[PDB]
Every structure is written in structure tokens, then in C-alpha cells.
Amino acid sequence: KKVVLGKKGDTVELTCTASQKKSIQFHWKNSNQIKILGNQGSFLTKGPSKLNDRADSRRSLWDQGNFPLIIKNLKIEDSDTYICEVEDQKEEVQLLVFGLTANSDTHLLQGQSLTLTLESPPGSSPSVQCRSPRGKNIQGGKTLSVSQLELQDSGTWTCTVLQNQKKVEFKIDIVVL
């Protein structure tokens, strides 16, 4: 089903269709139907949710019948199905947002090791395909590690994670000294 994905720090976009193209009543509501974002005529009811502080929408677009919904500064808890019920149907986006980091913070040495941590939201079976400036295709699941870390490994690492048909790129920054 139509998923979206995020990066624990990004935004995201979620779509709502309408045939009258007219700004008719839509509401954005998560799985068990709290109110999150809703067209009340010519107005937006910031629902009573976890997202009383974040969510939004491009407002102009409504008079076109395309109603969006964004989740700014995604943290893994904003990961949940949503729903849009413009006139007689209830389009459901599904947002499974995560993020990732490495263990090493500021200090590394040549021949040492580093590991990974991907902060998935519950119910996810992803696969982490991760890269290196040296072509170290670290092939495996969550916890990616290598026993060889060298001065040639400098430069960030394009890490990626497949969660149900998509991925999103990642830094793994490498700095020495």
C-alpha cells in the first residue's frame, strides 16, 4: 500500500485527492481516528493529537481539491497510518519514519572499529545496505560493523535502509584527528 518514509529530522508529504476540485471538507486522522488535520470549510482544525505541535499542509492547494499533510521534524513516533476522508472515501497514507547513527562520536583511530544503530519504528522488517568511500558494501541487517577502520575510510558513508519497497540515503560521517 502507498507508504511514505522519513529520516528522523526531515519533513514528509501526504496526499489527499478530491474530484470536485473545490476545497470540500477533509480531515486527517490517524489509525484509531484521533483528529489531526481537518478542513472545516475554509479552515484547518489542528486536531487533538501528538501532532498539536507539528503537522501542517499547503493551504492554498485546497481550492484545487488537493489537500496535503506534512509531519515536520519526524520522530519515530509520528510513524503511523493516517487517513483522509474528503467526501466518501478515506485515503490512508502510511508513514514509517526512522533515523540512524553510528557509535563513534568524535574520536577514531586507524585499524579500530565502528558500529551502527537504526532507530526503526515498531513493525518494520527493513534491510540496511550501507556504503563507504572505499566501496565497503556492508551487507546485512540492523547492526552493521566492520573490524577494519582506516585513514582511507575517511569521508562520510552513504548508508541506506529498505523498509517495505523504499529506502532513504544516509550520512555516516568519518573524520580523523
Place this chain on the structure above:
Amino acid sequence: VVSTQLLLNGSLAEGEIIIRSENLTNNVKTILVHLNQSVEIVCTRPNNNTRK
């Protein structure tokens, strides 16, 4: 006049207070009450705040 949840200089209610909606499954269905009495709302500010 136009106002939000609460009006000004406007209508009153005739007999008593009643309500306007339907199904209790998900319940957006905005509810409306007409309150069969009056209330006082009055805002004054003569100058009292010359410093802008």
C-alpha cells in the same frame, strides 16, 4: 456579525438549549447549542495605555 464559538450583539434563544449532530461512532459532526439566556460580554479601553 460573525464570531467563533461565541457571538456578540447577536441573536438569543427562544425556549431552551438544544443540540445538533448525528452518529456516535467517530463524531466530528460539529455540535451546536442555542443558549436560552443572555450573557454579558463588554470590553473597554479608554486610553490607559498611551505608550504604544
